[PDB]
């Protein structure tokens, strides 16, 4: 078949869009007349000398902005800002219309956006710089739709989603072929958790432009993850990596996470689990040979090293991530959770409970941190406190499928005795969730259910005891056999009772 790569959509496009759009050499006419100069961006192009030459020759603003874009690709954000400023100082822009000055103001706006993005810090200062540049551009030329796109992006960064959505509605009124408007709308919808609504926009953008940056396939894979079709997500991410093999390590990280999830939830045997887990570790390490300080990779490796009893290195990585990415609360929550898990072996119940609470406060979506908090409450013999916390969490999250939480609730209520009905409900929910997940149902839940049903239904209790015995197999104990025999004796099953007693 036809190879799926960047060259595929290169050949799909006409040769005008193939070579010219990716030229690393810029042709600049000279002020002397027909003389021109060609400077290759592969070589080390100096910003100051190039700007001085451009000002002397008074070249078209397109060349200035193209050089700025290339220096952006080089990462020279300061150099691109210098290019923009000296272009504003150039005679061409001063003698041109206000439209060119507005376009360069919007370019400086994009420069501020990139400066904020590349650092994820000083957000207010760069946002104010970008806002001032965008306001100047709009005042100089308000008819440019790029000013509206910049306004919408500014609203999105300040979480003014309604105004950005209105701006994208206006852009859709102007034209429905605007790819950037589609991307911004889909980003806002994903931020508003409208995964499917953003997914239609992702598909439309991908169909319109398969070579558009940012990659729509990243959002499509996120939606497939939200729609459980993670296999298609991985396939689309592989296609994106083929199209974008550079500066897209996040796709490889997502692929590694998907592989780890598949290994966890699909390995049919221990040997297959080991093979898949080691392959995922090798792929993660190969990605780490490019970047060795990525906080998410360290957090992921912390799980493996905690499973390897390397708690000291887990603490080192957690502290390093906390120092680097304290802005991200999710990393703080994960580090606190792992510190509490490490201290659990040390049984620092007060310290582990405090760490679990801090993890919950950093990121409330971390259910595991709350479950560890409840477990630590149990460790400190806080039966009532753990019960109150668990009831609060369940009543706030009645739709959450925390099977172990429901099992613990059932056990606590069985110990209480008076709340047997909630215990039955929670144990049945745990049984159903385990059956849906194809996970081994704990026979202890069956024993608790039989104990509860002793005073309600001997038939259901006996059936649950039989199910627990079938799960145990050779693990049947003396108490289970004695209770089965007593059940059959009460059922007048003399033969079966005698066999169970034997």
């Amino acid at each position: 078949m036809s190879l799926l790569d960047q060259d595929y959509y290169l050949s799909a496009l006409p040769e005008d869009k193939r070579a010219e759009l990716v030229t690393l050499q810029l042709t600049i006419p000279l002020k002397s007349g027909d003389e021109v100069v060609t400077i290759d961006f592969n070589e080390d192009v100096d910003v100051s000398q190039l700007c001085v030459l451009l000002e002397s020759e008074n070249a078209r603003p397109d060349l200035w902005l193209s050089a700025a874009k290339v220096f952006v690709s080089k990462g020279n954000i300061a150099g691109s800002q210098e290019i923009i400023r000296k272009a504003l100082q150039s005679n061409v822009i001063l003698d041109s219309s206000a439209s060119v000055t507005s376009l360069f103001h919007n370019f400086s706006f994009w420069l501020s956006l990139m400066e904020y993005v590349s650092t994820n810090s000083r957000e207010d200062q760069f946002l104010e710089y970008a806002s001032n540049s965008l306001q100047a551009s709009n005042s100089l030329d308000s008819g440019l739709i790029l000013n509206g796109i910049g306004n919408g992006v500014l609203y999105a960064k300040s979480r003014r989603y309604d105004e950005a959505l209105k701006e994208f509605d206006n852009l859709l009124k102007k034209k429905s072929t605007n790819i950037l408007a589609i991307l911004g709308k889909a980003q806002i919808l994903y931020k508003r958790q409208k995964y499917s609504q953003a997914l239609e926009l992702y598909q439309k953008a991908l169909t319109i432009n398969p070579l558009i940056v940012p990659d729509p396939r990243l959002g499509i894979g996120l939606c497939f993850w939200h729609l459980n079709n993670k296999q298609l997500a991985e396939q689309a991410w592989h296609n994106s990596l083929k199209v974008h093999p550079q500066n897209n390590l996040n796709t490889k990280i997502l692929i590694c996470l998907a592989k780890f999830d598949y290994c966890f939830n699909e390995s049919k045997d221990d040997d297959e689990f080991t093979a898949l887990y080691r392959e995922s570790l090798e792929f993660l390490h190969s990605c780490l040979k490019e970047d060795a300080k990525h906080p998410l990779l360290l957090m992921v490796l912390a799980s493996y090293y905690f499973s390897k009893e390397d708690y000291e290195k887990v603490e080192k990585l957690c502290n390093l991530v906390l120092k680097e990415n304290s802005r991200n609360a999710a990393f703080v929550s994960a580090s606190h959770f792992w510190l509490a898990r490490v201290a659990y072996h040390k049984e620092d119940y007060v310290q582990a409970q405090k760490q679990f609470k801090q993890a919950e406060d950093s990121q409330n979506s971390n259910t595991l941190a709350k479950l560890g908090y409840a477990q630590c409450l149990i460790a400190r013999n806080e039966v009532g406190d753990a019960t109150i916390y668990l009831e609060k969490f369940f009543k706030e999250n009645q739709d959450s499928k925390s099977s172990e939480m429901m099992l613990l609730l059932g056990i606590i209520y069985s110990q209480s005795g008076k709340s047997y009905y909630k215990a039955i409900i929670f144990l049945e929910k745990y049984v159903a969730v385990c059956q849906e997940e194809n996970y081994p149902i704990l026979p202890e839940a069956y024993l608790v259910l039989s104990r509860v049903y002793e005073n309600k239904d001997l038939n259901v209790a006996l059936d649950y005891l039989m199910k627990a015995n079938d799960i145990l197999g050779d693990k049947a104990n003396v108490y289970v056999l004695n209770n089965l025999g007593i059940y059959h004796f009460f059922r007048n099953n003399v033969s079966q009772s005698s066999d169970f007693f034997a």
């Binding site: 759009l21 690709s73 994009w110 432009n209 996120l222 298609l232 998410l296 999710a330 979506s365």
Partner: protein, 81 residues
């Protein structure tokens, strides 16, 4: 081990929130959208020559609904004769 099983169930669900770095959109990222002032319009009109057919078959497979039938005509107004 109960918390380990809970982690395995959860895996890295809530850790994908930071991975949204691909959602950010910047104009300068595209190489050829800026080389001319109207390169945006040219590239928006460069893909009008392309369609779903020109998409790669594997990328077409990525277009999954969240075939024509012979008995559903498209309406007309002048007919023929």
């Amino acid at each position: 081990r109960l918390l380990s099983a809970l982690f395995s169930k959860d895996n890295f669900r809530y850790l994908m929130n930071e991975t949204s770095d691909g959602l950010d959109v910047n104009y300068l990222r595209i190489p050829g959208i800026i080389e001319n002032e109207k390169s945006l319009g040219k590239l928006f009109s460069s893909y009008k020559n392309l369609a779903i057919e020109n998409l790669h078959p594997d990328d077409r497979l990525l277009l999954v609904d969240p075939s024509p039938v012979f008995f559903l005509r498209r309406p007309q107004y002048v007919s023929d004769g």
